């Protein structure tokens, strides 16, 4: 038989979860139209020579329905918790809001912190809108220090505006998911 795993991707709303599942699955950033929707979809993937069947569950739009949202979690096998590298407000929700939940509803499910939108850690605009609020983009240490703090299985950043280091996220979640 084959090895099914369920990966859920939680995290604040505004930081690109759907797409990152699109980009991972089609394996190509869509230039034409980024869908608003992504369906429970089973992605074929191999890691470490094992053949895996990663079943991918978006949670986009469940951010505000706190008793809905949990329907996504049950029987999950790895979790991509994530946050926008240009939104340090998202970063601090991680220990405040998602880790507590995920560790409740999905207990002993390995987490994978993820700095999405990495490619705006150097944007002119982005620096300078955050700089109106005293804030600044997430430094890659900050990111790791969060993932070690929240008891994650690893950290990972990746480009929003393309395909970048998006495979490497899913290879790693797939590695985690394979452990017990």
């Amino acid at each position: 038989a084959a090895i099914r795993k369920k990966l859920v991707i939680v995290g604040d709303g505004a930081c690109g979860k759907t797409c990152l599942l699109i980009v991972f699955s089609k394996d190509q950033f869509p230039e034409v139209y980024v869908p608003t929707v992504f369906e429970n979809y089973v992605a074929d993937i191999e890691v470490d020579g094992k053949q895996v069947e990663l079943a991918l569950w978006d949670t986009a739009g469940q951010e505000d329905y706190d008793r809905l949202r949990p329907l996504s979690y049950p029987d999950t096998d790895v979790i991509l918790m994530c946050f926008s590298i240009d939104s340090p407000d998202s970063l601090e929700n991680i220990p405040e809001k998602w880790t507590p939940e995920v560790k409740h509803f999905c207990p002993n499910v390995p987490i994978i912190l993820v700095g999405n939108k990495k490619d705006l850690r150097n944007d002119e605009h982005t620096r300078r809108e955050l700089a109106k609020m005293k804030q600044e983009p997430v430094k890659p240490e900050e990111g790791r220090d969060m993932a070690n703090r929240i008891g994650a299985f690893g950290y990972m950043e990746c480009s929003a505006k393309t395909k970048d280091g998006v495979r490497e996220v899913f290879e790693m979640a797939t590695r985690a998911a394979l452990q017990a």
């Binding site: 139209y33 929707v37 429970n40 089973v42 079943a55 008793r67």
Partner: protein
């Protein structure tokens, strides 16, 4: 696969500004998504509900426990979709012109009322549906045989039964995104505002379905906590308050909110409860093996009438909530700390609001 632009003539598109194209790209999604949904719902009906029903494996209440009103909704979407097919014919072009009226029609008004009721009954049953599948699978040669074989129909797309049931909740959830995008690329004032409202009503639908689901498992959770309760250590002889207390039956109340709290009742005596704010009382249990214990140490009772409650903020600890309980005897304070501010802020608010809801039922 394919975007909207694949279907339109090169020349048609070149008559459209680059974001009217975008709106189209979305509206197209709204529509083709709806269909996919409707397809899944059908799988559920044809692949699963219908063949097991026929097979004989499940009884007619086990059937309903698993599948519940999958019909009512299947049909709801089926019809919501032909309503969309409709909207496509309207226009000679494949440029779906103004779509606002139609979004209010499907999502506001009496469409709202249909979707939210049918949804809530479907979506909320899931917990209880999944329990059944998981159970009746360990419990039955044939039922498990059956789900397995059914899962291998390529209509499934290699999703399992349990992976397909959560979907009604899923769609509902996306409606206010799609609308918000459509609305976002909608150049025209008077019709943008329509789309913006239709989105709003897809939210109100959500909260409803959310609040449906909360109630429905909160019922089943009191049924369980009440069963794993303990009042043996309850002092027959101290305060005649206490028949109401031995005989307390969580199960007759609506549970508004719950979770684990830390009772600082002294700097040398500080407890960790598991706390139920029910409809009319607040309850202060102690987890202990499985049994949750109803007890009252140095007396402060573990139950607190919300008619007497006043909350106050503890201006040092940012996680601590001064729950006064105002009586004719004294006024007994229950200083309570949470794990994260974010919790305290909701304890504060749900308590504060119950207090005044209850007191305003004179």
């Amino acid at each position: 696969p394919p975007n909207w632009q694949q279907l339109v003539s090169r020349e048609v598109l070149l008559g459209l500004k680059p974001c009217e194209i975008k709106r189209q790209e979305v509206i197209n999604e709204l529509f083709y998504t709806e269909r996919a949904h409707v397809r899944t719902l059908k799988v559920l009906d044809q692949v699963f509900y219908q063949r097991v029903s026929r097979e004989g494996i499940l009884s007619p209440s086990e059937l309903r426990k698993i599948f519940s009103n999958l019909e009512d909704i299947l049909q709801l979407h089926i019809g919501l979709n032909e309503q969309m097919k409709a909207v496509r014919k309207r226009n000679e072009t494949s440029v779906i012109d103004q779509i606002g009226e139609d979004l209010l029609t499907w999502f506001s008004g009496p469409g709202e009322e249909k979707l939210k009721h049918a949804a809530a009954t479907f979506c909320s049953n899931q917990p209880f549906a999944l329990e059944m599948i998981k159970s009746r699978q360990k419990k039955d040669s044939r039922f498990q045989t059956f789900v397995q074989d059914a899962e291998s129909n390529p209509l499934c797309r290699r999703l399992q039964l349990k992976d397909i049931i959560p979907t009604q909740m899923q769609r509902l959830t996306k409606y206010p995104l799609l609308l918000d995008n459509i609305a976002k690329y909608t150049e025209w004032p008077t019709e943008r505002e329509k789309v913006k409202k239709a989105a709003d009503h897809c939210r109100q639908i959500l909260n409803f379905v959310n609040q449906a689901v909360k109630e429905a498992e909160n019922k089943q959770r009191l049924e369980d906590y009440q069963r794993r309760l303990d009042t043996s250590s309850l002092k027959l002889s101290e305060y005649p308050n206490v028949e109401e207390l031995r005989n307390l039956d969580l199960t007759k109340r609506k549970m508004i909110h719950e979770g684990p709290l830390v009772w600082k009742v002294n700097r040398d005596k500080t407890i960790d409860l598991y706390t139920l704010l029910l409809e009319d009382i607040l309850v202060l249990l102690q987890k202990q093996d499985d049994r949750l214990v109803l007890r009252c140490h140095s007396t402060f009772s573990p139950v607190i009438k919300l008619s007497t409650v006043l909350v106050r903020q503890v201006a040092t600890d940012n996680k601590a909530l001064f729950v006064i309980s105002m009586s004719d005897n004294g006024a007994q304070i229950y200083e309570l700390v949470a794990q994260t501010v974010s919790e305290k802020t909701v304890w504060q608010d749900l308590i504060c609001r119950m207090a005044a809801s209850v007191k305003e039922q004179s």
